[PDB]
Short mmCIF file of all heavy atoms in Angstrom, two decimals:
data_model
loop_
_atom_site.label_atom_id
_atom_site.label_comp_id
_atom_site.label_asym_id
_atom_site.label_seq_id
_atom_site.Cartn_x
_atom_site.Cartn_y
_atom_site.Cartn_z
N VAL A 12 -1.12 -20.42 -0.52
CA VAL A 12 -0.04 -19.47 -0.69
C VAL A 12 0.43 -19.51 -2.14
O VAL A 12 0.46 -20.58 -2.76
CB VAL A 12 1.13 -19.78 0.27
CG1 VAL A 12 2.40 -19.07 -0.17
CG2 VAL A 12 0.77 -19.40 1.68
N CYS A 13 0.78 -18.35 -2.67
CA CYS A 13 1.26 -18.28 -4.04
C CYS A 13 2.63 -18.95 -4.17
O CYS A 13 3.41 -19.01 -3.22
CB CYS A 13 1.35 -16.82 -4.50
SG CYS A 13 1.98 -16.58 -6.17
N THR A 14 2.90 -19.46 -5.38
CA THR A 14 4.15 -20.16 -5.62
C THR A 14 5.31 -19.21 -5.88
O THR A 14 6.45 -19.51 -5.50
CB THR A 14 3.98 -21.12 -6.80
OG1 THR A 14 2.76 -21.85 -6.66
CG2 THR A 14 5.13 -22.10 -6.86
N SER A 15 5.05 -18.08 -6.54
CA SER A 15 6.11 -17.13 -6.83
C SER A 15 6.43 -16.27 -5.62
O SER A 15 7.55 -16.29 -5.09
CB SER A 15 5.71 -16.26 -8.02
OG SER A 15 5.22 -17.04 -9.09
N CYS A 16 5.44 -15.51 -5.15
CA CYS A 16 5.53 -14.80 -3.89
C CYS A 16 4.92 -15.66 -2.78
O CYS A 16 4.17 -16.60 -3.03
CB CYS A 16 4.82 -13.45 -3.97
SG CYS A 16 3.02 -13.55 -4.10
N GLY A 17 5.27 -15.32 -1.54
CA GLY A 17 4.81 -16.09 -0.40
C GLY A 17 3.68 -15.44 0.35
O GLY A 17 3.66 -15.45 1.59
N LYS A 18 2.73 -14.86 -0.37
CA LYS A 18 1.60 -14.15 0.21
C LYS A 18 0.33 -14.97 0.05
O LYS A 18 0.14 -15.63 -0.98
CB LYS A 18 1.43 -12.77 -0.42
CG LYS A 18 2.61 -11.84 -0.18
CD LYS A 18 2.35 -10.46 -0.75
CE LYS A 18 3.64 -9.78 -1.21
NZ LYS A 18 3.41 -8.84 -2.34
N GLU A 19 -0.53 -14.92 1.06
CA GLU A 19 -1.76 -15.69 1.05
C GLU A 19 -2.70 -15.20 -0.06
O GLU A 19 -2.63 -14.06 -0.52
CB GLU A 19 -2.47 -15.58 2.40
CG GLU A 19 -1.85 -16.42 3.49
CD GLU A 19 -2.52 -16.21 4.83
OE1 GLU A 19 -3.40 -15.33 4.92
OE2 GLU A 19 -2.18 -16.93 5.79
N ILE A 20 -3.58 -16.10 -0.47
CA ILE A 20 -4.60 -15.80 -1.47
C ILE A 20 -5.79 -15.18 -0.77
O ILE A 20 -6.26 -15.70 0.26
CB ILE A 20 -5.00 -17.07 -2.24
CG1 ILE A 20 -3.77 -17.79 -2.78
CG2 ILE A 20 -5.98 -16.74 -3.35
CD1 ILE A 20 -3.10 -17.11 -3.94
N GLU A 24 -9.88 -13.02 -4.94
CA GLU A 24 -8.85 -12.67 -5.90
C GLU A 24 -9.06 -13.42 -7.21
O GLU A 24 -9.61 -14.52 -7.23
CB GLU A 24 -7.46 -12.99 -5.35
CG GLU A 24 -6.35 -12.09 -5.85
CD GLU A 24 -5.09 -12.20 -5.02
OE1 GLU A 24 -5.06 -13.04 -4.10
OE2 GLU A 24 -4.13 -11.45 -5.29
N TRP A 40 -0.04 -22.37 -7.40
CA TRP A 40 -0.97 -21.30 -7.08
C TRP A 40 -0.41 -19.98 -7.60
O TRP A 40 0.75 -19.65 -7.33
CB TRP A 40 -1.21 -21.20 -5.58
CG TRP A 40 -2.12 -22.24 -5.02
CD1 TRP A 40 -1.76 -23.45 -4.50
CD2 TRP A 40 -3.54 -22.16 -4.90
NE1 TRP A 40 -2.86 -24.13 -4.08
CE2 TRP A 40 -3.97 -23.36 -4.31
CE3 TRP A 40 -4.49 -21.20 -5.24
CZ2 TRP A 40 -5.31 -23.62 -4.05
CZ3 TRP A 40 -5.82 -21.45 -4.98
CH2 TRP A 40 -6.22 -22.66 -4.39
N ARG A 41 -1.22 -19.24 -8.35
CA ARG A 41 -0.82 -17.95 -8.89
C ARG A 41 -1.85 -16.89 -8.52
O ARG A 41 -3.05 -17.12 -8.67
CB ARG A 41 -0.65 -18.01 -10.41
CG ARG A 41 0.55 -18.79 -10.87
CD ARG A 41 0.79 -18.58 -12.33
NE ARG A 41 1.74 -17.51 -12.58
CZ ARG A 41 1.73 -16.72 -13.64
NH1 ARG A 41 0.81 -16.86 -14.59
NH2 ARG A 41 2.65 -15.77 -13.76
N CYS A 42 -1.36 -15.75 -8.06
CA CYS A 42 -2.20 -14.63 -7.66
C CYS A 42 -2.39 -13.65 -8.82
O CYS A 42 -1.70 -13.69 -9.84
CB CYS A 42 -1.62 -13.92 -6.45
SG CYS A 42 -0.07 -13.03 -6.75
N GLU A 43 -3.35 -12.74 -8.62
CA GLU A 43 -3.73 -11.80 -9.67
C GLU A 43 -2.57 -10.90 -10.06
O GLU A 43 -2.33 -10.67 -11.25
CB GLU A 43 -4.92 -10.96 -9.19
CG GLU A 43 -5.53 -10.07 -10.25
CD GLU A 43 -6.83 -9.45 -9.80
OE1 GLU A 43 -7.13 -9.51 -8.59
OE2 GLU A 43 -7.56 -8.90 -10.66
N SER A 44 -1.87 -10.35 -9.08
CA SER A 44 -0.75 -9.45 -9.37
C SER A 44 0.33 -10.15 -10.17
O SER A 44 0.84 -9.61 -11.16
CB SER A 44 -0.18 -8.90 -8.06
OG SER A 44 0.94 -8.07 -8.31
N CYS A 45 0.70 -11.36 -9.76
CA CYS A 45 1.74 -12.09 -10.47
C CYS A 45 1.30 -12.45 -11.88
O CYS A 45 2.09 -12.38 -12.83
CB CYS A 45 2.13 -13.35 -9.70
SG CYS A 45 3.20 -13.05 -8.27
N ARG A 46 0.03 -12.82 -12.05
CA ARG A 46 -0.47 -13.11 -13.39
C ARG A 46 -0.42 -11.87 -14.28
O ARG A 46 0.07 -11.93 -15.42
CB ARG A 46 -1.90 -13.65 -13.31
CG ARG A 46 -1.99 -15.03 -12.69
CD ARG A 46 -3.41 -15.51 -12.56
NE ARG A 46 -3.83 -16.26 -13.74
CZ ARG A 46 -5.10 -16.47 -14.09
NH1 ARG A 46 -6.08 -15.97 -13.36
NH2 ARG A 46 -5.37 -17.16 -15.18
N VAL A 50 4.90 -12.58 -13.67
CA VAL A 50 5.99 -13.02 -12.80
C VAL A 50 6.22 -14.51 -13.01
O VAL A 50 5.26 -15.29 -12.93
CB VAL A 50 5.67 -12.71 -11.34
CG1 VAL A 50 6.82 -13.09 -10.44
CG2 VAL A 50 5.32 -11.25 -11.17
N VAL B 20 5.98 -5.19 -5.36
CA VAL B 20 5.66 -5.61 -6.73
C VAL B 20 6.12 -7.03 -7.04
O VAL B 20 5.88 -7.52 -8.15
CB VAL B 20 6.22 -4.61 -7.77
CG1 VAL B 20 7.70 -4.76 -7.93
CG2 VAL B 20 5.52 -4.78 -9.08
N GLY B 21 6.78 -7.71 -6.10
CA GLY B 21 7.01 -9.13 -6.23
C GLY B 21 8.34 -9.54 -6.85
O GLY B 21 8.35 -10.29 -7.84
N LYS B 23 12.37 -11.22 -6.41
CA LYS B 23 13.05 -12.29 -5.68
C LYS B 23 14.35 -11.80 -5.04
O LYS B 23 14.61 -12.10 -3.87
CB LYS B 23 13.35 -13.45 -6.63
CG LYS B 23 12.15 -13.99 -7.37
CD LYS B 23 11.19 -14.70 -6.43
CE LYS B 23 9.84 -14.93 -7.10
NZ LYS B 23 8.98 -13.72 -7.02
ZN1 ZN H 1 2.13 -13.66 -6.28
#
Side-chain angles (χ1 to χ4, degrees):
Chain A
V12 164
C13 178
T14 314
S15 312
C16 69
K18 296 184 211 150
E19 284 176 354
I20 308 288
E24 210 165 4
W40 283 92
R41 289 191 94 211
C42 68
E43 187 170 13
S44 177
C45 283
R46 291 177 92 201
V50 183
Chain B
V20 75
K23 306 291 166 277

